[PDB]
Symmetry: D2
């Protein structure tokens, strides 16, 4: 199995993509053994990016690596098709899309048509990004089978049964969990990996959890997974999408600029409190020789 980073998008103070900070971060993740980078995902604030910015993201990360899954979805299908066709000049892993978000009670037929249209024009393997809480709908294993053109799925859902069902109904699909908390479990249970937000700031940890679980050192894998869980839980206290910037700076030592409001940056007080929640974790990890310091 693989660890895939849904890469954070660094913004400048005037709310443009900071390409140079993105490249440093992408270069670091690849050097620390991350397999592939999922670009314009939730963690990257994809829904907050215009189609031009989605492409800008791809071009900057492509300067560093071709190991990219390029997320192109949105609520203007013409724009998503355009992005899908534009990726033809990039030798990347795949494109991806979440389901059309916001609008409740879209028909199965319309959802299947949305995705089949993207598969039709795609010059690369297409990945389903299934995220029911964020999008308001579920594209489960049976609807994925019906659409029939997915090379893989990232399933972000608190239900590993649902994730396993993609493998059960679609044995040749790549099946990833969108959860940082399930690296050990996914690797132990025959699933294909994790698209793990926390791999942005602790890539060392997520790679080691997966490696321990593969060696069948499950007790050791769980011990490290449970420490990683505590960092995930701390990030959620003030808002994980904002906190991910602060933790990256903290653990990896470079900054990633700002998020895009209404994803507001943490303020000084929040930042102090987040750091006190994780500094003792940061100490144990150095002690275990997972972090240099």
């Amino acid at each position: 199995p693989e660890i895939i980073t849904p890469i954070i998008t660094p913004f400048t103070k005037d709310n443009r993509i900071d390409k140079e900070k993105l490249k440093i971060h992408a270069e670091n993740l690849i050097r620390k053994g991350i397999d592939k980078l999922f670009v314009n995902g939730t963690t990257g604030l994809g829904p907050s990016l215009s189609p031009e910015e989605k492409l800008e993201n791809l071009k900057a990360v492509y300067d560093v690596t071709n190991k990219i899954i390029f997320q192109v979805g949105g609520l203007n299908l013409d724009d998503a098709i355009r992005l899908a066709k534009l990726s033809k000049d990039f030798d990347i892993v795949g494109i991806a899309s979440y389901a059309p978000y916001y609008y409740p009670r879209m028909s199965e037929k319309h959802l299947v048509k949305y995705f089949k249209t993207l598969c039709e024009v795609s010059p690369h393997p297409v990945y389903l990004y299934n995220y029911p809480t964020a999008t308001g709908k579920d594209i489960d294993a049976k609807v994925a089978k019906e659409i029939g053109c997915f090379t893989g799925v990232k399933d972000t859902i608190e239900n590993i049964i649902h994730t396993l069902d993609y493998k059960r109904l679609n044995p040749n699909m790549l099946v990833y969990s969108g959860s940082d908390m399930l690296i050990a479990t996914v690797a132990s249970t025959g699933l294909d990996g994790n698209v793990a937000a926390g791999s942005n700031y602790l890539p060392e940890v997520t790679v080691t959890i997966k490696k321990l679980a593969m060696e069948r050192k499950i007790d050791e894998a769980l011990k490290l997974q449970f420490l990683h869980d505590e960092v995930i839980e701390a990030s959620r206290i003030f808002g994980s999408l904002s906190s991910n910037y602060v933790l990256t700076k903290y653990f990896q030592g470079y900054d990633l600029g700002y998020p895009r409001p209404p994803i507001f940056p943490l303020d000084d007080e929040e930042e102090r409190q987040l750091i006190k929640k994780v500094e003792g974790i940061r100490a144990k990890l150095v002690e275990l020789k997972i972090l240099k310091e």
Copy 2:
């Protein structure tokens, strides 16, 4: 109380806004007694429109009427602030925003800051558009009170206790329901009216339900409410946002062109089936003299 229409955005064959069809629609709604027009709401596919398109909708409806509430929200706060500021040269009723959508678990603090930021730049009264199912969050009467700058609220939720609470905790706030099914009830219970999708295609019916209920003719109000409910129900069979186009053309006589995919237009068969579902209702309305042939 008032009936406000969240006006449909008509799109051309090549996916631009049909300004001229929009004006025709807006004019008919106003001539048939609709009090105000909510522009760029859900029914108008506001989340599917770029900022520039949200501005085109306003300019187009503004040619017809100034009775406008202008929805400006999105996931790029700089753009929302820019729209809010641009509305200064339009003598309209107010601007509005739904909560930032897609991203789950945004803190109350961030949500409050988002809306306070809009109020601080707005040259017009601000309306809260609360739609928990679509946006993934709830800006309830308590949180609305804390934000403290709303002139009104549109509450799309089936729970009328929640809606009544806005008036309870904010005695001066204008409080509308986002339901077509609650016109008689809202008018009967001391609330300010309804922002009703179905008033796009049946403005006569929604205005008459309201009038009947105002005259304490609740049995007759409910009878007409219950017929309207059947049309709402029919529009959900193939998807309401798509179905609204077909119903407007059927009941009002002119077309509103296409929705924007992934809100796909009904096909010929679906259109025929939908009409069969509402045929008997159109006949009953004609015979009650609510509609003419």
Copy 3:
């Protein structure tokens, strides 16, 4: 419309039904204008009562009045059938049942069969007690129409559209809301009234809201409704089912003993904090001549 009290079951210090306190409570409620008494409901802890105790409650209240709806439901259909049959000797208004609770994913067919079975043996009219949150399932207007034998429904749900649908699909059904917060609304919108827990402790308030709404004094009805809402809200701080005992003693001046654990009695400090929350409301109601003192 009516106010119907789901009457509290007072337990002794040794956890038996206090028959005498129950008779004192029921006499008072009838004296204060309550229309009918709903026995073994949620407020009366019906699910915590054996079938023998559900019969004792009926016997005790029946000393006081024949204006009773006798709730008989549970997870042993043979006991429910036996309670329904034994009600033949009581000249009461009707029997009732919630849907079989606890077990999730019960089929429509099995649910319909449960209610038809009680209707087949009942010597009295049968009321549906619909409470999806408590029981895990919803017996909606269409399912009720299918069952075909209900005289009325108590709908405890946060969605008045759902409650109105009963009236729409079953024009001759008596349709009650299970909320205290919807008394003014229900009476304003042509529904049949409320089965209101809060009428245990403020019967005078619930009757007055209803009367004001009936007289089309909706602003006065709402002012009083909103006051009552605050009491309901206070009652939820330490748990409504427990707090209802304390409020009844405080507002009505007699004791109703204890709830049955695990519905634990409030402790002294909770009771003191509760009263602190509603003491100013009591003063208002006294000043308004709604309560005597």
Copy 4:
């Protein structure tokens, strides 16, 4: 890890526990390698049993084996305390209770007091039976740690993150999943096993999935797991609790009498339809040499 059966309670034609059928079934389960029996759980219709019947289930099963976890919970705490104290004369593994069901919004404090009360009187290790969908309450890993006295937990929820958290926050607790679909995953990931309704009718399948998983034959384990998933899905067509009876008779060759209505028995046609849905699975299991014939 272990497979524990939440054993079905067979009822006679006249709705009494059929002790001799229960003993035959219990004996067969143990003989087929099941580790322990969980008595009066959901699958055994514990909420449909009086305290006396719960105790009757214990005595009949105790005739066969002492490998019993005795479920005692209910909405009369005195009756639960009684069952707990009565279990003193049985040399069994532990007692268990689900949370108080039906009543929504019970306070954490009241939930904690309920379990601690049971723990203070228990003469055996106490197991938490956590089942949020059935009971309306979650007793998560943090609330379990707060109660402090649980030797183990059965977590019936699809979200394995939640189940792993028990282990993370209570390293000495036995942690079981209540899912049949997670047997291979649970065993693979360092958890203590599964309390699996489907082990009543296919104990051989569930034990073999676990054994294969333990051997790190994950692909083999998943292939069997996936067949077992199909039987679980088949059982849900007409209602799993009722279907479980028909499936046990079909696969194990003896019958289990009747469930207790409103858990209604499948009729002749439903049984034939259910058999046709699992027939081809049986043949696959025969070909895999899991079953004879």
